[PDB]
Amino acid sequence: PLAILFMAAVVGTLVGLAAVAFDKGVAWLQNQRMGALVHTADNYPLLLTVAFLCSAVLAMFGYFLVRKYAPEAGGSGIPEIEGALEDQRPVRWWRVLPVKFFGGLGTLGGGMVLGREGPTVQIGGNIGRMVLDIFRLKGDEARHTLLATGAAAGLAAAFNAPLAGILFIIYEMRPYTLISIKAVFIGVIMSTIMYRIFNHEVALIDVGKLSDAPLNTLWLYLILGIIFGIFGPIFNKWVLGMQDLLHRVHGGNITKWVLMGGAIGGLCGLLGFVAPATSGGGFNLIPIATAGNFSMGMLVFIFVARVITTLLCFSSGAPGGIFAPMLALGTVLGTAFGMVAVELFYHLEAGTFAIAGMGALLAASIRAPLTGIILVLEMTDNYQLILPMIITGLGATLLAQFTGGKPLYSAILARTLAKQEAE
Amino acid sequence: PLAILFMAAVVGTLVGLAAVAFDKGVAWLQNQRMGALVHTADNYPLLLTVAFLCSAVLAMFGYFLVRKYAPEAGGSGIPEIEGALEDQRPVRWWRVLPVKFFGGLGTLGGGMVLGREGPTVQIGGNIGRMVLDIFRLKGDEARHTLLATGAAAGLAAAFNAPLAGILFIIYEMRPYTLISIKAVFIGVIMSTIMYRIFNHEVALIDVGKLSDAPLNTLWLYLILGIIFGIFGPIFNKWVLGMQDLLHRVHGGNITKWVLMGGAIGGLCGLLGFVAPATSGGGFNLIPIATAGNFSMGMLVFIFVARVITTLLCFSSGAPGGIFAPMLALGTVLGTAFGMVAVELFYHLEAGTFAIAGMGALLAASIRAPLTGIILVLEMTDNYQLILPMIITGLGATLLAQFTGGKPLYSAILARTLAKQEAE
Ligand SMILES: [Cl-]
Ligand SMILES: [Cl-]
């Protein structure tokens, strides 16, 4: 039906504006947190206290909204869209949309280590469901198609990356008709154009162009892969385990949870001023890191800072994503390997192994190799590292297989589902 | 098995060198055809006669080798690799490899309107089969996996485009295990690196960087799509029909066929000197055309010249591809629409609609939309036209659906199969 191809356009266009706002939203909440500190930019004990509390409040707000009204708006929300496409999960958009948005401005705006793609995809998905209900389109086809174009449009707008969005939903989320593919395109065209209208000529990741990688250099990317390939499934266990560790801290009780959350949002809000490249989504430090401005000491610091703050903010059921984070760890560890590879040798530039590393964690952890490659392509515009990036991918994603890990988003879903049976 | 991931490396590396030679091969045969004319670069009637006969011979040679020894080495050879993956077609590499190669140097070297990707994929496929037999690996898994990495490696090396190769085989040839995907990667890494070792710092398509497309400009790409979207299935009928039209000219008889072929190879060899941008694979004129050096009159000439020479050389069962051709028609028609769109208006540059058009025919005719997009990306390195290109794709590939056409490569196979039942 022409119906869905039309519907898909409108879902794209809503998901576009939806995400643009969630941006201008987070954007604006951080401007405030500047003024909160520029008022108190003398009294140093106070400076640190507002920094904390401002953030600690906003997390709690968001944390509350999830645990009050929309439980399944904790975490990424992508395992929920996975589950929905599997007809294993409801899409309660009437609850989820307003929660995941004001929830997300909570924790992202307080500067916790979460990405927008968490929100934008679950939202974008819920929005696809919302229009399906409104026009009361009947069938599995239309239920799934709008669900998916919503996700695709969400992800596209998170990273200004239409090709990424299409690839990830249509191809790297398990085994789509002829038309539902085009719906997803139409969904992702509109979504992008919206973002592009309200954002054009301001990128998320500047790195200009780095050099090629010499053919003699390539074998190194494969090793970087192999490392990410064992690290990915370890870090998965950590995020899966840490969900439990922080659950023995509050047993389910909402007041305990919203206290924990604002501690964890405050901590992060604090690190906002003191140690900036340990907070945020990653997108500030990625280019600073890729330009090579970080003393390998600082690298291993930021790496461990962020691998802890990431697990802390994400595994603690906050509304937010672990996708932008896994780009920033990708870059920071890529850079390190990079410097170590330059010292150890060839015509290398640690720069190029950041780019390569950036997508490597998506390959290793969530097991979307092509999405990762095409994403860093679209974000950095470094055409010239595609073969390294394919090589890093293979390595990352072969080891992650043999080291026995599973796709993070599925393992999350398959818990959520085993829980909604043994209860 | 580690066995196939190893095997896949060796298939990649053979398919790499295989294709590199088929290049240096065609490369070298055309150097000769220069000297044949630079000898006779006064006597103008003679100049034209060697030009013809040189080419007319080489076609016949190749045409002979197909019709003598390896029938299923006529045409693209990709419908055969399709059919093989479906277990519907044998892969007689012992016959096909030496035919498709020396066959292909025949017709490509004589400057007929065929692409290398025809050869390189069927060859690359056959090479995957060849190593499967040599190590006598048992199973469907390994039969299919090496077959596919061979195809993927072939296509990658045809266009120096690893991401294209992976995408097309793994995703845009119908509904692959976990490991057979990685085999295909490993296959395509090696294949590329080989090509890259023997070719680096000399591209197939220079166009530098053109400008963006303004959001106000986008709707135009969709119309260009819509046009390609009706043209694709028409041009399919033509190539399918023309196979028959040229078959009522020789009823099957080899001597008739090899005469027809050398006429058609001679014709093309002639147009080599007289009207160059009507002969070859396209890759010379694509950039000349995209730079905008062609008077819209000349465009519509070259368009009709090539749509006839293409159908003539391809539908006449020559060893060669209709993929590079469909890039050159993509570009020439994109450019035209381009000029007409500039005249009619906005901040346009016909340049950008060439790029867009280039992949549009792959989308419309063979129905590999993403492969087409990612290919022109990898070949031109114009990052900045991805959203136009997605838009052109949708348009191209929606209409091609509703206008009722099928994927060219499948329709070819499904004939070949209906023939091998009603006989
Ligand atoms: Cl996420
Ligand atoms: Cl072809």
Swiss-Prot record, chains A, B:
Tell me which CDD domains the record gives: EriC (cd01031)
The UniProt keyword set, sorted, is: Antiport, Cell inner membrane, Cell membrane, Chloride, Ion transport, Membrane, Stress response, Transmembrane, Transmembrane helix, Transport
Gene Ontology biological process? cellular stress response to acidic pH; chloride transmembrane transport; proton transmembrane transport
Q: List where in the cell it is found.
A: Cell inner membrane
Motif Selectivity filter part_2 is found at 115-119
Q: Where is the short sequence motif Selectivity filter part_1 located?
A: 75-79
Q: Which residues cross the membrane?
A: 2-38, 46-69, 93-110, 117-135, 181-198, 219-247, 254-275, 296-315, 321-342, 386-402
Intramembrane runs of residues: 78-85, 146-158, 162-170, 351-365, 366-368, 369-380, 381-385
Reported function: Proton-coupled chloride transporter. Functions as antiport system and exchanges two chloride ions for 1 proton. Probably acts as an electrical shunt for an outwardly-directed proton pump that is linked to amino acid decarboxylation, as part of the extreme acid resistance (XAR) response.
The record's subunit annotation is: Homodimer.
Q: Which family does it belong to?
A: Belongs to the chloride channel (TC 2.A.49) family. ClcA subfamily.
Query: What is this protein's record name?
Result: H(+)/Cl(-) exchange transporter ClcA
